[PDB]
User: Fold this.
Amino acid sequence: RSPWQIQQAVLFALFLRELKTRLGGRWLGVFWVLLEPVAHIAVMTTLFSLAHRAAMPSIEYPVFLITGLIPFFMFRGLVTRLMEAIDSNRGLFAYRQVKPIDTVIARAMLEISLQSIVYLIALGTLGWLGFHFLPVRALELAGVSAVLIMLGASLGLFFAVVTNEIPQARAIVRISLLPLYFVSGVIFPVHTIPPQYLPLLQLNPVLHLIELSRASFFPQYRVLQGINLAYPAGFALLSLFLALMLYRLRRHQLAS
Amino acid sequence: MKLVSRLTAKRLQWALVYLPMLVATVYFLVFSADRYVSESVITVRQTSSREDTCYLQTYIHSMGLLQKLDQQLKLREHFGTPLRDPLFRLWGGTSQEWFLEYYRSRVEVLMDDICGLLTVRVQGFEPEFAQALNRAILEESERFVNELSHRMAREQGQFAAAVESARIEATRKLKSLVVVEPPVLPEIAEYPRRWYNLATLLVVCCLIYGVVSLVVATIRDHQD
Amino acid sequence: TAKRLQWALVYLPMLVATVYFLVFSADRYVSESVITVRQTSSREDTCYLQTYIHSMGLLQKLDQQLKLREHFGTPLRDPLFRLWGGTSQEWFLEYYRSRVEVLMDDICGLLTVRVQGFEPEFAQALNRAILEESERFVNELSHRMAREQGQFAYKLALAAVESARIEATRKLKSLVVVEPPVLPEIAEYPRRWYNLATLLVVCCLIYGVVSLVVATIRDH
Amino acid sequence: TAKRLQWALVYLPMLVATVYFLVFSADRYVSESVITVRQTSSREDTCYLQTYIHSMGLLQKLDQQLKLREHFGTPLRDPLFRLWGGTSQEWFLEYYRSRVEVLMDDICGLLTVRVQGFEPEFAQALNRAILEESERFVNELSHRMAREKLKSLVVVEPPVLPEIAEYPRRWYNLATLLVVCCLIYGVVSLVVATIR
Amino acid sequence: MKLVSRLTAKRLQWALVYLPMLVATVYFLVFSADRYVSESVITVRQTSSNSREDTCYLQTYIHSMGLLQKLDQQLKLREHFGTPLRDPLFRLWGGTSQEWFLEYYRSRVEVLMDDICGLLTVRVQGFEPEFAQALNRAILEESERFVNELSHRMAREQRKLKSLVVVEPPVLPEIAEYPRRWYNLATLLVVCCLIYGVVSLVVATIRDHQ
Ligand SMILES: CCCCCCCCCCCC(=O)O[C@@H](COC(=O)CCCCCCCCCC)COP(=O)(O)OC[C@H](O)CO[C@@]1(C(=O)O)C[C@H](O)[C@@H](O)[C@H]([C@@H](O)CO)O1
Assistant:
């Protein structure tokens, strides 16, 4: 048996286990992951519909919200769920074909599959309501989505490796995932904030990725200066390098 | 249950990956038709103000302009010439609403809020036809704005010394359209991008095949 | 291999940095001026000036007048802080842009210019040269603006032409100076200690990351 | 050991500050003035005054008028705050900027100038000379602009003769130094104990 | 560290629990001095057109020094504020510096600005009600004189230009607003208790630790 085949086997089994425990005993989690974008959209439109109409009179608010929200939901899930994978299977590390990175990859693939299903369903009901739901340049959208996915998975693995001890710090990162929602262009277009606050917001790679995904989605969408893809690409590459290094070095102490 | 197990990975791959490739490859490289585009940028201005730009943007996708253009250049018979492509062609005998939707899908108007310019891109199966359609749209546009101004001034004159001023206002083209870039003449087709469409299709079918394989495997495992 | 990396990674760059900074460096005196253009009879005019200081035609006029080429190559002690003989025009422009610093106070609406030079008198003379050239630049810009309508054009029309021909010679816009160029006597630059501390931070970062890389690759 | 950081860290700065502030310090009187420039027929002129007060040319005219270089060298007992003889021009500029504090209140456009000196009459004279020269520059700007009383200075609070030395606050400085020195001791002791 | 065990519960109480009310009761009842307050409300208008900034001009001018010199020459504040020998805390000691006199005057005269629509309210404290009213009236008249001279100067360098609106004239108080004796006693009780509880907890844990 090749190492690749046993890797597929262990990933399949771990995916089955983690999909069973991610949703409820009678699949109550699927309702929550379908309803959370709905509640977010309801609150956001009912709070800023006229303001966003005044912002630019060319893009409807719900499609803008979906395109900026579903990738952020996937990124937040990848960051916040990948790091609990170590403590969920402490007792499972006794069968000599199971490694922590297998749990990491299983959780990541599930997060990706679930959010992709949610994205497809959301685009379907958005087109069903008479909105705009076809990306003009879908290949660049796929590229930016892949960059965002790799950045999120790398950060999740990095936080899983570093915070194997001190679980209080785990909680902390979830708190820091709340302001990241309110800054990275998810709610309101970034053309309305006063310009001197701009570069302090431009070190956030998720802002750049959201802006480029929206630009590749809509026809004739305007981006600001310094919203290059090179900065998120380099951030993701460096984060993945450091995460893999730290997992390799601190490998043996992730035992039972 | 039993119907869930009545398949395999190769069967799913043939159902969701290579068959769309076959139909897309025999469409785009064989059955498709070229679509040249012609591009212009216009903006009105008071002689001797984004409102009249809105009037123009609504008027381009209007219905009366479509009737005038069909009377002038006979768009209905032109768009049915490419039988090769049964989809992007205009089937004869269709209703007026579908014709209006087809025309709205062909000519595309875009606005930029920072500068206020109105860009028009017109799709046609011939380059000279696309240029002629763009020029006809522009001249009917200018005629519409001038006719609106003349209608207001003619109503003012119809209310009624001031008669000469009303006649001058009726004759004077107060609002005029200035063309930043004249309607261009295309050389090759650019909109039916075959290879890019095939590539994004490849990404899409790979993704849905992976997702459906995972969910069918988990429902097979749960059903046992 | 646990001590040799520290030797050349930081110890030696630090040592060469200190011997260069304490011995090989040369003085750079800075002349400071504070200006704001005013209409005789506003942010756009000082914006034009701010673009014009870092321009190239002004640099060519200054090179013709004050001969900046030979002076910036005189301090032979510095190999990196002097202008190399027979360099490129683009490198010369970048050197001039780096040696002349222009800041804007938008709330106060004032333009401050700090010009560096290897002699105390040259910095003041160069700053006065930029002042005079900027004044004549805005003056000639207004004159060229009025020249088209002056050259474009019964008795009242000729009277209007006579009354408008003086627009090409009237001094409509004037450069008001708040702080004239100064004559320094102690060099402000280089700031050896802050650059040294920056080298401490950068060298520590590179040493840490390369130590992590080596410790990771060690058990492979 | 721990007594080395117990004594040499916190005590010696306290003896240094005690032997400086109690005997070696020099009293510094301060005068204050509150002004605003207004046209007789305006924040730009206020900003002009702000950048002109701390300038170079004004320092040269004031050194010609009142010779501050001689006045700031009188106290030999204070080695820090006195102006050392034969120093650089730039250090003289920083010394003048430290000795003349200007504050901007932009909710109504008010300039306030506090001038420190070792003599009270000298401080008042310096403040009055600064006010007069700033007014002269304010109208001279418009005179040079219109050459090829346009403006006036409104004096809310004229320069005031001080009677007692407001600066330096010896007890306040000693107390805040003591607090920081103890804090520093606390943090270094905690880390040096928790490293063990 | 040996003195930590000395601080028993009965001791720390007499320390900061009871002592403070002893000194507060023997000060606020038999040693303090009454301070009558006169309140006026003004605003300067735009009559010199042929305006919050002039109100802030006035706010800076009231707490100035030249006005204090004028008022000291006019009504002799320095000898008046040394009248109560009973209370030294609320009294102006003789022979003090000019800067301390300025700080005392700034403490006695309180100026606030209603900022929604700019109303200048002035409260003046004095040991006699008629003196407080007189000081308020003198402040208002010097205020009007300065705001008129504020323009008279540039008019002369280049008629009552500006004007002072008196919404609420300086009233004559009957009873003294300050000091609030029983109120200060109640807040003092609250604070002295809170700190006693906190320090009792900290002395208990430092006794248990060592
Ligand atoms: C001010 C910024 C915005 C306003 C937020 C206001 C905070 C809400 C109020 C507190 C909501 C709340 O629940 O508290 C939070 C505190 O907010 C944060 O996280 C700060 C987020 C910083 C990242 C922001 C990046 C932005 C992203 C841009 C790209 C967790 O902290 P906590 O005090 O509750 O933890 C105490 C635990 O009991 C024990 O943890 C320890 C401890 O004592 O052993 C251990 C460890 O040191 C650390 O976890 C902890 C401490 O020291 C480390 O700050 O203390």
Q: What stands out?
A: Residues 141 and 150 of chain D are 9 Å apart (CA to CA). The pocket of KJ9 is lined by residues A 168-169, 172, 175-176, 179-180, 204 (CB under 6 Å). The helical segments of chain D are 3-7, 11-24, 43-53, 57-66, 68-71, 89-99, 120-147, 170-195. The two ends of chain D are 12 Å apart (CA to CA).
